[PDB]
Design a protein around this ligand. Structure first.
Ligand SMILES: NC(=O)c1ccc[n+]([C@@H]2O[C@H](COP(=O)([O-])OP(=O)(O)OC[C@H]3O[C@@H](n4cnc5c(N)ncnc54)[C@H](O)[C@@H]3O)[C@@H](O)[C@H]2O)c1
Ligand SMILES: NC(=O)c1ccc[n+]([C@@H]2O[C@H](COP(=O)([O-])OP(=O)(O)OC[C@H]3O[C@@H](n4cnc5c(N)ncnc54)[C@H](O)[C@@H]3O)[C@@H](O)[C@H]2O)c1
Ligand SMILES: NC(=O)c1ccc[n+]([C@@H]2O[C@H](COP(=O)([O-])OP(=O)(O)OC[C@H]3O[C@@H](n4cnc5c(N)ncnc54)[C@H](O)[C@@H]3O)[C@@H](O)[C@H]2O)c1
Ligand SMILES: NC(=O)c1ccc[n+]([C@@H]2O[C@H](COP(=O)([O-])OP(=O)(O)OC[C@H]3O[C@@H](n4cnc5c(N)ncnc54)[C@H](O)[C@@H]3O)[C@@H](O)[C@H]2O)c1
Lengths: 295, 301, 295, 301
């Protein structure tokens, strides 16, 4: 098992470190454009092995040749829509030169589009390319409900399809505390607020740090997904994937419940959404598929 | 944090070992009536510390003075069962044990595991003289675990993403709420036929017996030990987790005094909140019938 | 990764469970001769998955056909020397019918001989077959030193070659607390005692339980070894392996420091022992190689 | 168990996150001088709890009253360094911080991380007014970690099996004892040429600078955070671990009063024992020279 995390900033570095200590890979390559930074961070991570008790071979590089034969590739490269799309497209192209069949997990925003960009570029089947967002939105939502109710975050479940912001589709219907519907524990008034805080959760962090975005939750989320693939856990998580009919959408990437296994997306769940939500999901997908045209 | 586990059998020991490795306690005492067994299992466990990387001081004893001033006590003392069985004996055991520990620990949190659970928990609570918040029994978590593992098998999904609501107690007293059973929030009724769900609900119902018939000379202990610890960890780490445990109600679900398996918030103060969820008439009905049967025996004792 | 643990008694069951929760395998097969027991224990373990958060597919069986294509096989079968040798030889033969190239880790006593029996039977190269004992003896010794000094067991190191009992070769020279020689922390008087307690450590447990042997420490030890192989950790642990010259011994299995990787024994370390110890190791190996003749 | 971490930077935050996930504390406070950063990093961390499965209450603050009654305090406040550097400033920072926390916590265990370590630890201890057992600094563990990772690379063995003894402090004050450096007990001198060992001893010596030159805008934090936590975990779980930490000697190694990096037994009472190992004249010599230099500055302050 050889994993490559493109991008050595907070997100990709926090991600690689977690992936290193969890030992989900024998070889882990942290690659970035800036000289030095990737090499120093990967070394700092490696020298952590004797105390954290992991033996993952973590190396930082600038040469894609060091990412040859990677099984999984995490793309966190980013710095507009036309710019990043180019960054993502180029990166995908460079890795596809040294790896003929990996699973690509995208973490760049706009997620859905960036994921599409990468996919259509790699030439890999829609099963081998996915994006991360739902796990993260779900996580923020779950933590808000926890703070509200004074319960453990492990017992809170939150079904969140779609993308970030106005494109987010939180299914309050499939959201619970130990199976007990949130609707029976929290007023709709407050639930509406917690749903709002979730839509603008990334920004809430940014408004705090001023510089850059959030990276702990985002990194932890990406790993949960990678872990499922590596350990063939068959976990069901809301990821961005290319639909092929479900939800009355075809071709365009959307955030829907999926089963992640050694072969990536092993199943797309078409849950029962009510018109409202099902509409927002289709509009949002139209807007997205729109942009994927210019590109 | 000192944790005492009465009973060095399959459940008690497996539980103790798990507690040791997880390092939830600084001092872990494994006491039993039969001499030798707790000491040997305790040593075998401790000698595991260098490879499992934990330093919990696990001590096996036959003397209750060693349990003095405990924060949490796990009671697993009692005879299991053979293929063909289904309280007179354990009632006395559990009571003797409880009164025995209370001499050395005046304010612990007791977690009862001994069967018949609901009733054995009442016996301990009754004998301890501790407020009902400090005494609870383990059952729901295990029942839920089995239901989840089955659904996972059926759908081929991770057991982590399956949620199962199960209240009441074991056997016909088991009230599994398919309504609050899901796969990543998605209702199981939307993924598995009702006909097949009832069977899985059946397997769950007779889950313990399925293990007993296989083992033939005893019952299950791995899942039971894992479940007990999930509960203790919540208390130790004050995680405020919501788990189905056997506790003494005070009106919720239309039941008073008797111990029932309901969703509760578990913290360092024990039962910090009892959740009275929404159940249809048929479920409240069973839950209350069961509750009366249990309430029957308890008084008969 | 598919692992099979032969023997469903305390040792093999405690082992399989630990292997299940650590997720070192996708498929884990617990096989035994007695009907029912393996099926019940493996099920009890599996139903533990939702609370212990692992998804290892653990199944109990009586049909070796269910152990087909196993990568690693842990043999804990046992119930005299001629008896067990037959048990081990038969088991090895049955698995070799459904798996052409696994790594075999033996846990039956007498270890060295039982390991040889299995090896010469499987027909596999000496790299694919090893036995467990040193890790366990080291572990008991390490814990005694810890109890004596009032320090953590993680920081105690103990080099132990040879086998159990009189065949045990504890190198007090290579035994330390954070690198600090035990000889500088504990009197030779007491060290002699702690070394004695180690030689008879298995029996100390048995004298307590009356029925059967110890199984927690023995199981934890076996896993450490298996973990190293599965995760290609390249750990250095004293295991029983077929030497090929080192220590002035050839062919006969001995407990020596080795590097365990995805290919099993990747290196045998010939440390510098003083005559005394080096002698006890050769005598012990002669006695062993003696018995491996009758068989 | 309440743990305060002063400094929400790369080391402070990475450390806090690790502490949160490991659940070693119920309440974890991340305080900094710059407003916003600790709050944001704290939230980002907490929002990680549902996927990382931990419930530690991580709160980011700018107010010291939030650190009140802390059991353990980790000081990482201070300016790092850029390629080309090697105390005047941090001395004031560390002292201000220490006197600030002591107003709200009257008996914590302070773990200093701010450079120059040996000296910054003296500054805190001096200002806290706490017995020398309650104040220690982190350095040895990190130095040892780097040496181990190098040997592992060189021999192709697990880093878990490599043991490295390193005393003193960073730089020329670093006293790595090749004599007590091994691979599964086997002396490294028996596995690696002396010539190559000295180089690895060199890399270790300038390890931090190697990271600094790569990063260019800051220093290392992953290994440093991992090392600090290894120490805190020992205290929290009273594991009595033996780690090389910077502490105030009282004669051992022929050094009095000054802080030196020596092997110590770490428990809930802090430094529970200082180990005076056997060193040859040359090593005792450096250790003492370094110690005097450090003892020099401290008084100059
Ligand atoms: N999926 C989500 O919901 C989510 C959450 C958080 C952040 N993000 C996004 O993830 C990205 C990384 O966030 P961060 O906080 O780690 O940022 P960052 O700026 O610290 O790190 C990104 C790193 O990528 C490098 N980079 C840029 N272009 C590159 C290229 N072509 N090849 C290789 N490296 C390149 C930069 O130089 C930089 O060091 C951002 O685009 C951000 O918007 C997404
Ligand atoms: N709540 C559940 O879901 C659940 C699951 C499994 C087992 N159980 C119950 O837990 C109990 C233990 O199961 P087990 O498999 O560990 O059994 P076991 O027979 O292996 O062990 C029970 C131990 O209790 C000891 N014991 C008996 N009387 C005692 C007394 N007065 N004081 C101290 N120790 C005493 C025995 O000597 C024995 O070692 C049984 O009552 C069983 O039915 C409940
Ligand atoms: N390596 C060590 O240092 C070490 C430590 C402890 C125990 N051991 C040895 O390990 C073995 C297991 O110990 P245990 O405590 O688990 O014992 P146990 O008797 O509880 O379990 C062994 C199981 O193997 C089964 N068995 C016997 N022959 C078999 C065959 N041909 N095929 C399949 N299953 C068979 C039995 O029926 C039994 O259920 C013993 O031989 C013991 O002496 C070695
Ligand atoms: N002991 C070791 O082995 C070791 C390893 C790495 C770093 N360090 C040292 O640790 C310190 C922090 O390193 P870093 O990488 O986290 O740096 P950093 O610059 O990322 O973070 C330091 C944080 O301290 C805060 N700060 C400054 N003055 C403060 C005051 N008076 N009160 C409260 N907060 C204040 C800053 O605002 C900043 O967020 C440095 O002094 C560095 O040299 C020691």
């Amino acid at each position: 098992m050889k994993i490559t995390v493109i991008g050595a900033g907070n997100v990709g570095a926090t991600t690689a470190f977690r992936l290193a200590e969890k030992q989900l890979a024998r070889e882990l390559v942290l690659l970035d454009v800036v000289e030095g930074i990737p090499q120093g961070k990967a070394l700092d991570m490696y020298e952590s092995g004797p105390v954290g008790l992991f033996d993952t071979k973590v190396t930082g590089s600038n040469d894609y040749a060091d990412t040859a034969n990677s099984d999984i590739v995490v793309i966190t490269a980013g710095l507009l829509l036309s710019m990043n799309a180019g960054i993502v497209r180029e990166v995908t192209g460079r890795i596809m030169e040294h790896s003929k069949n990996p699973i690509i997990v995208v973490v760049s925003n706009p997620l859905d589009i960036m994921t599409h960009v990468a996919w259509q570029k790699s030439g890999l089947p829609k099963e081998r390319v996915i994006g991360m967002a739902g796990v993260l939105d779900s996580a923020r939502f779950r933590s808000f409900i926890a703070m509200e109710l004074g319960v453990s975050m492990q017992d809170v479940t939150a079904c969140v399809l779609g993308g970030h912001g106005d494109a987010m589709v939180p299914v309050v219907k499939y959201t619970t505390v130990a199976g007990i519907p949130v609707a029976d524990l929290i007023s709709a008034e407050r639930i509406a607020e917690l749903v709002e805080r979730t839509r603008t959760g990334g920004a809430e962090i940014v408004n705090h740090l001023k510089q850059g975005s959030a990276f702990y939750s985002p990194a932890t989320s990406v790993v949960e997904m990678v872990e499922s693939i590596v350990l063939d856990r068959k976990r069901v998580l809301t990821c961005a994937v290319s639909l092929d009919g479900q939800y009355g959408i075809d071709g365009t990437f959307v955030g829907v419940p999926v089963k992640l296994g050694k072969n990536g997306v092993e199943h797309i769940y078409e849950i029962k959404l009510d018109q409202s939500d099902l509409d927002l999901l289709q509009k949002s997908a139209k807007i997205v598929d729109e942009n994927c045209k210019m590109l």
